[PDB]
Amino acid sequence: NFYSVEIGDSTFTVLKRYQNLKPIGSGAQGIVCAAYDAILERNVAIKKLSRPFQNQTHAKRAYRELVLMKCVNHKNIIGLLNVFTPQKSLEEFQDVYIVMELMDANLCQVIQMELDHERMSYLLYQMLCGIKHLHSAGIIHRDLKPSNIVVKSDCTLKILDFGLYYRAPEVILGMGYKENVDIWSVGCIMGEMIKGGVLFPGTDHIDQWNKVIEQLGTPCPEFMKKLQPTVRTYVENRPKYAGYSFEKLFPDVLFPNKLKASQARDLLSKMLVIDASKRISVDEALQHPYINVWYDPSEAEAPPPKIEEWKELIYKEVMDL
C-alpha cells in the first residue's frame, strides 16, 4: 500500500502513487518534498509534520494546520490534495503527511523582474482575493511576504500558508491589529515590484521602524498616544521626519500609460499608511480602479470555508480522509 524513501535524515513513508520525491523545504513546520502524483498525474507537495505531538505546543499547530487546510478553499490559496498516515492504528499513530498543490516559484524573484501593469495589478488582484478569503474565514495572516506568495508560469497566484521587513507597524510594535494589517504587506510587496528592492530595509525592528517613519513621515500625535510609553519616548526623541510624496518615493522613472502609473501610486499611497486606522481595507483595495479591472464576484467574494488527547483529535482529523 505504502513504501519508504529515504530523504536526508528522515524517512518518508508515503502512498505509492507519489514518486520522484525531492526535498524542497525544511523548517519548523516540517519537511516538504516535491513529488509526482501518478494518479492526478501532476506535481504535488508532500509535507511530513515534524514531531506532530512531542509537546502540547506542536500538536496544536498540527491540529491547527489540518483543520484549516480542510475547510479553507479558494483558487488563490494553496489547495490541499490529501492527508494520510502510514500507521495502521491510533496506538501506533506517529506521522502526519499533507499533500498539497505544487507551484513553480514564490514572488522573491518575479518581483525583481519586469511586470507590466497587467501582470502587476493582476498578481496583486489575486493576492487581495486570497487574503480576503483568508480574512472572511477569521484568519489574519500577518506574515505575508515574497517567499510567502507562490505563483505559476500561467500567471496565477496563491497564498502558501495561513501564517500565524514586510511586517506592519502594529506588528513590529507590541500593538493590536485588525484585518488591514495584511494590506501593509501588500503595500510593501507591491512597492518592491516597482522599486526593485525591499522598500523598508531594517537591520533590526528598531532600524526598520526608523526607515519607515523617515520615509513616510512621522504619524500624527493621536497615534503616538496609542503607543507604548517606552517606544513613544523613543520616537519623540528624533528629528522631525516629514516623509516624501509618493511621486518622489515612486517616480515615473519606474512606470511604463499615464493613467495606470498614477493609479498604482495612488493605491500605494493608501496601503502604506503607518496609522492602521487611515489605511485602506481589502474591499476598498479590490474596488480601487487599478485592481478593479479583473474584479469578479465569484473570486473576490466566494462564500467562507466554515494532552495525549491531541493525538486522537489529529488522528480523527486525518482519518476523515
Partner: peptide, 10 residues
Amino acid sequence: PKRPTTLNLF
C-alpha cells in the same frame, strides 16, 4: 481586458 496567460519566472 484579457487576463495574463503567462508570467516569465526564469
